[PDB]
Write an enzyme that holds these catalytic residues in place. Structure first.
Site, short mmCIF file in Angstrom:
data_model
loop_
_atom_site.label_atom_id
_atom_site.label_comp_id
_atom_site.label_asym_id
_atom_site.label_seq_id
_atom_site.Cartn_x
_atom_site.Cartn_y
_atom_site.Cartn_z
N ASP A 90 62.23 -115.77 -19.05
CA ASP A 90 61.52 -114.80 -19.90
C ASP A 90 61.90 -114.96 -21.36
OD1 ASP A 90 59.47 -112.91 -20.18
OD2 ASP A 90 60.96 -111.27 -20.24
N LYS A 103 61.15 -115.33 -25.14
CA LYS A 103 60.13 -114.95 -26.11
C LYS A 103 60.84 -114.25 -27.29
CE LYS A 103 59.05 -110.96 -23.15
NZ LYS A 103 57.96 -110.15 -22.55
N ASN A 116 62.61 -110.94 -26.87
CA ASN A 116 63.83 -110.89 -26.08
C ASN A 116 65.05 -111.37 -26.84
OD1 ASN A 116 62.75 -109.77 -23.88
ND2 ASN A 116 62.69 -111.60 -22.60
N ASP A 151 68.02 -109.38 -21.74
CA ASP A 151 67.03 -109.26 -20.69
C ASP A 151 67.15 -110.40 -19.70
OD1 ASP A 151 64.97 -108.18 -19.24
OD2 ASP A 151 63.77 -107.72 -21.04
N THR A 168 55.96 -114.06 -19.15
CA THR A 168 55.04 -113.48 -20.11
C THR A 168 53.92 -114.48 -20.33
OG1 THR A 168 56.82 -112.22 -21.15
CG2 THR A 168 54.85 -112.54 -22.48
#
Ligand SMILES: CN(C)S(=O)(=O)c1cccc2cnccc12
Ligand SMILES: CN(C)S(=O)(=O)c1cccc2cnccc12
Lengths: 353, 19
Positions: free
Chosen positions: A169, A171, A174, A187, A204
């Site tokens: 994840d 991005k 984060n 996260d 995502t």
């Protein structure tokens, strides 16, 4: 060859030294993973100051530890919410990983505890805010600025993958900027111990690797794809694949086509074509040379990987910091009261938390 | 421009994981 004798010897030695480091890091992680922390504080040890972020599971709040005056980010998760959102295993797993890993760009869990209604993960406060906000504000990062951040993600993924952890994840949302301008990965709700393959559709949309979209059994190379998406977005100001709806984003991702802003250097574009490579047998980070294909890429020629890891590189950007409890780098969120029910909710589901 | 297309996509804000 590309390297003379002194360069090649220096490079090979450095590569063996990080192998030595990762081997020791893997042993310390497993030892911590087998014997994890629990119930290390309580709610009234903290003043709750402000909500820094929100999500489906709950909220993250700036808190102040009463005894020490230290500020922390306290993630509050509604147990009943977590169940209904089918996130029991993710939340337990995230906490278990967070307490076991140790790396300069991974946020540190300082305390954790639970009560009748909620679970609490008390992490270091990272006061510089999300990379997301700075990226959208500035528009785009210069390549040196993007490279500085990218280098930390490369080291962080090198570390996690050596622990057989897929991150999944990545991005800007984060990634938080600390006071020295370095990155903190937060996260781990989608991170998983995967030596081989795994099949869960998660992540995502803009950052999904093609093999996730195509329902394949995939591996840690999805993180290297996501790194390509991140580098592109940091340097362009927008991600390589976007559209009104995720289904149209997915069509672009699997298409094997990517266009670059004209201001992208050819070094950058070459790296991105090798990260944003739909063919797993050609994707950088997934070849016999592993992460060294990335770290030795021309776009990273100026990167001192050791200096980055030691945090001895002056950051290209240092966020406005006006004190230890400053939240000016975070957006504002509606404040909901923390209600601890008299009835213990979901005691069995979160016994090990 | 590609940036204009990005704006027109409406996905300029914080993006949720898939659910
Ligand atoms: C991403 N943030 C806006 S957040 O959810 O509030 C958050 C999450 C995890 C750790 C944090 C540490 N410091 C600040 C914010 C923190
Ligand atoms: C060479 N050392 C072991 S180290 O500078 O402490 C180090 C630690 C962890 C990861 C690294 C990746 N690249 C270069 C150096 C790294």
């Amino acid at each position: 060859g590309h390297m003379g004798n002194a360069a090649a010897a220096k490079k090979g030695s450095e590569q063996e030294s990080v192998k030595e480091f990762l081997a020791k890091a893997k042993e310390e992680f497993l030892k911590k993973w087998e014997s994890p922390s629990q119930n290390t504080a309580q709610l009234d040890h903290f003043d709750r100051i402000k909500t820094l972020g929100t999500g489906s599971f709950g909220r993250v709040m700036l808190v102040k530890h009463k005894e020490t005056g230290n500020h922390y980010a306290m993630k509050i998760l509604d147990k009943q919410k977590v169940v209904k959102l089918k996130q029991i295993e993710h939340t337990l797993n995230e906490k278990r990983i967070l307490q076991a890993v140790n790396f300069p760009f991974l946020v540190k869990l300082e305390f954790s505890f639970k009560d009748n209604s909620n679970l609490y993960m008390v992490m270091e406060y990272v006061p510089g805010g999300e990379m997301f906000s700075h990226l959208r504000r500035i528009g785009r990062f210069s390549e040196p600025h993007a490279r500085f951040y990218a280098a930390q993600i490369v080291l962080t993924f090198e570390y996690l993958h050596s622990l057989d952890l897929i991150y999944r994840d990545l991005k800007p949302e984060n990634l938080l900027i600390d006071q020295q301008g370095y990155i903190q990965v937060t996260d781990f709700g989608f991170a998983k111990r995967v030596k081989g393959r795994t099949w869960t559709l998660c992540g995502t949309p803009e950052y999904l690797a093609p093999e996730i979209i195509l329902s394949k059994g995939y591996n840690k190379a999805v993180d290297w794809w996501a790194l390509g998406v991140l580098i592109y977005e940091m340097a362009a100001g927008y991600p390589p694949f976007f559209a009104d709806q995720p289904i149209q984003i997915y069509e672009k991702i699997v298409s094997g086509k990517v266009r670059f802003p004209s201001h992208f250097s050819s070094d950058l574009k070459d790296l991105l074509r090798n990260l944003l490579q739909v063919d797993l047998t050609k994707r950088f980070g997934n070849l016999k040379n592993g992460v060294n294909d990335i770290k030795n890429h021309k776009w990273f020629a100026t990167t001192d990987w050791i200096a980055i890891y030691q945090r001895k590189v002056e950051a290209p950007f240092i966020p406005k910091f006006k004190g230890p409890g400053d939240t000016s780098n975070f957006d504002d969120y509606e404040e909901e009261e923390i209600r601890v029910s008299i009835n213990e909710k979901c005691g069995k589901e979160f016994t090990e938390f | 421009t590609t940036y204009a297309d990005f704006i027109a996509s409406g996905r300029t804000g914080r993006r949720n994981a898939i659910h």
